[PDB]
Symmetry: D2
């Protein structure tokens, strides 16, 4: 019955057996001495196959999402690539979101399509659209919720029942919510994907990815690709991600509180046409978010009345929010998806409005963040 | 006209502009501040796409192999996976070696074949066999020389002419020789692959991979997959690999000298049936090795007269050589390919003899290594 | 008018000039290229003298304590040693606390006394005792508040007026409170000492120290000893400490809330004779703590009715609290000062009661911590 | 009977007991779980006191110098400070070299003299001057050989007999020679000092120090100061130093060969008045160097016929040699001691000639280094 914040510090992380070291060592090693041929020590043989620091991260992530197996990768994108290489083959079909991380769209449309996988982008906020989009060849439904960058909401349990009726897998990219806010496996998801670059590492200082699964056999198929394709998290990056995880609860509590205050400053600001945040009662899918999320996240998007020109000006004018790609760090970030993170979706069903600004609201003192936005919004 | 050892220390590695730091900093960062939307600083935007520490490693590797572009990956296997995902598609064919790293065989036969790529294993030491094995669908010839673990030799320039006559690419996995001993691009190869886990990092403490190319357009296609699939080397691992590269010349000189002495101790030892080393005049392909290699490497393989049982005993009895997977570190390693690194090729054309022992001869004091082998060989 | 949590993330930490990297690079370098003899780049010459990663930590710490200069060291003890070597000489006298970190007592009594510095331990909770203990040779009053391990309270502003009337310095070891809870320079202290090993690094994974001063000339004298004695924080440790600082506010808020709940569970528990916590209204110096501290900290000490035997049993029985030295990490720790951290004060004025247990209450889920203590206390 | 290069890789560095990891883990931890109060695991309790990564470095260094105990510090200067704080007290006297690292002079003259230690600088190349300079209060003779920067030579065995006849300790700062070239404890020294920043780490990327002793009781007194003053090497720096040590033999062989070639280019160059190198037969103390050194080192100093003005020009003109402080890295460095490393000795007995240039000859390709010097020397 251990609580989330306890598991984040302790799961996978018993003190070292030989020395008692209370923090997992950094096993910066490629290989391991065997006691006679095949006489493994502690089950280790070669670091791409398994590394003890990476094991601690994988076990911690599995505990936090309530899965049987975690797997850590060199980036979120590498987690996605290993997942799709494992579960798809030429001739298969994928349903993907109609609003998603540009890199997900690029991997599916520009690499996997060349390799014989078909796809359709669907409004995942409409179960009847997802049900209808199933094809005989569909192997998976790929869900982000909240979506990047509009923060639209998908009912994970509802979509799990649709996927499973079609003998398809439900994949949830839980990057934005993190395990602290949302636990897709508990609602029927088969696979959880993270970019640990974002909230799990939490400090804008590690690029990494992860998968967590409910089914041990699927976990073994994914681990075979983790080993054979080799897109693994290195031990030092894994160690920093695990260090970050230890404060996910306290960071996420502050991201959510600071984002609620930022939303209050944006709603009704005369320069702001629309505020996108799952916690607003009139946000599409608010009631689903209330069902499935502990709180509504640190991300806030909004549209400028004066269009792209006004949005580009706001993005250049902040002095506390930093203009950069990425999200989920302690530090506040701002960007223009149209020209930055989502320029890769221009011309597709996933194209983002040119008047949109995306915020990753950090854990700085909230009055500093509100004041910085208010001066940046002033024409 | 700068020499190899100079380039290994200096290429990609000018002192820091702001501070003069003589060693490349570790840019443990995920993202970069822009000066206005799209106003990149120094061309950086997001670490999976490019990171300044990874850039220094990539530029150094390109200089050492004489290529236009280097790309660093999370492991050798990830370099291979990104290469094959870029240059092949369903319906294509590959020629691979008939003696090769088990992970190469596993990736081609167990992942890419499922994804619609056909393959044949060929004796690359016989140009007429390679020429004959070309098919209309062949996109690449994949060469290891010396091969892992028998140390057979392939004439890179000869195979480049065969590949290019078929409008195919020549890929050379230059892991065993390293850039210090062999420079495949100078002999017509299109792509060089490394496991930097081995001699380039040099200290059995980093898992990593690299590609180097001669053609800038192929380099851009590979970089698109590096970014989109995301199997990148992290900055700290990249930094340790680069640190290792600085001593490649002096380490490799000592590996070669110590391996020549170990060969002298094994040849004619009454328990040893055969010694495999490119530098022995009667080794198959010795004259080609003399042509294309500065020296003959740190790897030595040998077969035991008393069969698998004798080989397993030798592997358990060394006290200085460590029984482990991997190779190319300062420390001496021993293994039994049949049951360790090449158990994955059992039942295929690449199956290794059960009486074979593989040594990675390290840079310890040579009399200690010879004495350790001599006591381990004593029945 | 920037807030603490903003400064913790941003002070000393502008994005990199050349690349925009949003996180300070790890300048793992010993030296720096000069443009002509004495042509320094960015003022750097040799890492013991100054290193850019260590500078960012030093500037951040100075901002958080409101000082003009910060200095980072290899450990808290090294910060203390460099401080005392700078401000004292043979023939000088120090006033130290009558309850203090055992290492402080050991450094003063077992090293500095041999080197000709006299000392007296005084009850710093009694201003009239401190005033009375001044001698003509007294150069400094060394204050911990709250004290390690009894958590007694000293009125910093009152003691600053006593020190300054005697032309002596007031030194406050602010390790337990951290800059987030208490800012001694704002109350007249001359020097703040930290063990950054504790709450500032926050993750039980770095040993480090710091000094912060109000007066630039004293800062230059300390920096001369930092350079000349060389007990510097290395850049990677400095970088991890700085990463930890980014979450000090959210960690400390949770440590304080969880400690208040633990205090409620201990007060009136039939096995517990006394609970020591600054936030209890009847704790000696509570009203001073209310004046000078934002909140009352994560440390809680308590005495067992059944004596040393009962205290040793509790310390061995916890399953969530880990039995270890140290404090201020995310993870909960328990120890017995009498036999562990304060065995070095046995036989002195600083001897700790044998029936005392010290807790560093971490940020795990509070019900898990309360339940673990309650089962450990059950006879 | 194990050889130096074997010990450098293996001593202190058995594979990990639990996992077999062939490289020592990075124990980035502050503390260690105890099994009951005082139930240490593997003897560890708190990282300032001992850390397993720092232990491996300390054990390796002890093996390489043939001592009973090694101790690692935050810098060379911190090793020196802990040594002198341990072995001296007010009223004691030290003999120091008349040519030495400026930081040694600064620590003795500007810190320890204030703390009541007297000193004299003596020509250590003249045993009769050292014998004569002994005073009743002399506690140690501090020897550098070769000296920084003139490369003068002291007969360690001769000076050990003088020190021991006076019941004084002989301290040898073995930084320039390293353990691979010179083993002072084997010639009667009591303590060896290193800056591991230089040849031991070898890559200009770690600041660190070490002590090695022959007598276990002196080792315990030094360890008490290591713990109590806390100027320890952190685990990551210790780990990089240990990685560097693994290639000391092959790096030093190349430094010596490249320095011999550079000496040949400087001797008789019309712009060069004098070349200082222990290997030149007419260098003062050459025959002693032949006795006590395996080879003559990577350092080369020389005086310019055209004086300071010519020396400053050479230092600014090199394109391969980098103008910077420090020495002992793979990369070649040049400096002007008068204005850079030894400006701190201006006005003392240790003042360096203004026409002197110091080279740390690196392991780059020797023709590149000779050509770079020859163009820099051209007026
Ligand atoms: Mg364990
Ligand atoms: Mg540059
Ligand atoms: Mg800056
Ligand atoms: Mg061991």
């Amino acid at each position: 019955y251990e609580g989330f914040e306890t598991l984040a510090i302790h799961a996978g992380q018993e003190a070292d057996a030989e020395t008692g070291a209370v923090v997992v060592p950094i096993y910066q090693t490629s290989t391991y001495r065997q006691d006679g041929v095949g006489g493994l020590r502690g089950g280790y043989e070669y670091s791409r196959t398994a590394n003890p620091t990476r094991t601690a991260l994988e076990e911690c992530l599995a505990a936090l999402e309530g899965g049987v197996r975690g797997l850590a990768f060199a980036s979120g994108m590498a987690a996605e690539d290993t997942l799709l290489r494992t579960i798809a083959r030429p001739g298969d079909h994928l349903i993907i979101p109609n609003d998603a991380y540009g890199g997900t769209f690029r991997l599916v449309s520009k690499v996997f399509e060349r390799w014989g996988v078909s796809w359709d982008a669907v409004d995942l906020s409409n179960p009847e659209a997802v049900r209808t989009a199933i094809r005989p060849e569909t192997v998976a439904i790929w869900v982000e919720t909240p979506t990047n960058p509009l923060l639209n909401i998908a009912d994970i349990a509802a979509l799990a029942d649709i996927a499973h009726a079609a003998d398809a897998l439900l994949v949830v990219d839980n990057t934005f919510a993190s395990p602290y806010l949302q636990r897709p496996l508990s609602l029927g998801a088969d696979v959880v994907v993270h970019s640990t670059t974002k909230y799990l590492g939490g400090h804008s200082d590690v690029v990494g990815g992860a998968l967590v699964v409910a089914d041990a056999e699927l976990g073994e198929r994914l681990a075979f690709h983790q080993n054979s394709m080799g897109a693994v998290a290195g031990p030092f990056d894994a160690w920093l991600t695990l260090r970050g995880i230890k404060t996910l609860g306290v960071r996420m509590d502050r991201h959510c509180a600071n984002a609620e205050r930022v939303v209050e400053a944006l709603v009704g600001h005369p320069e702001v046409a629309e505020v996108l945040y799952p916690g607003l009662p009139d946000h599409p899918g608010h009631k689903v978010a209330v069902d499935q999320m502990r709180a509504f996240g640190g991300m806030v998007s909004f549209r400028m009345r004066g269009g792209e020109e006004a949005a580009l000006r706001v993005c250049a004018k902040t002095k506390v929010f930093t203009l950069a790609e990425s999200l989920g760090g302690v530090e506040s970030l701002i960007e223009h998806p149209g020209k930055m993170t989502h320029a890769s979706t221009a011309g597709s069903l996933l194209e983002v409005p040119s008047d949109l600004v995306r915020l990753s609201v950090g854990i700085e003192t909230v009055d500093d963040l509100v004041n910085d936005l208010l001066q940046a919004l002033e024409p």
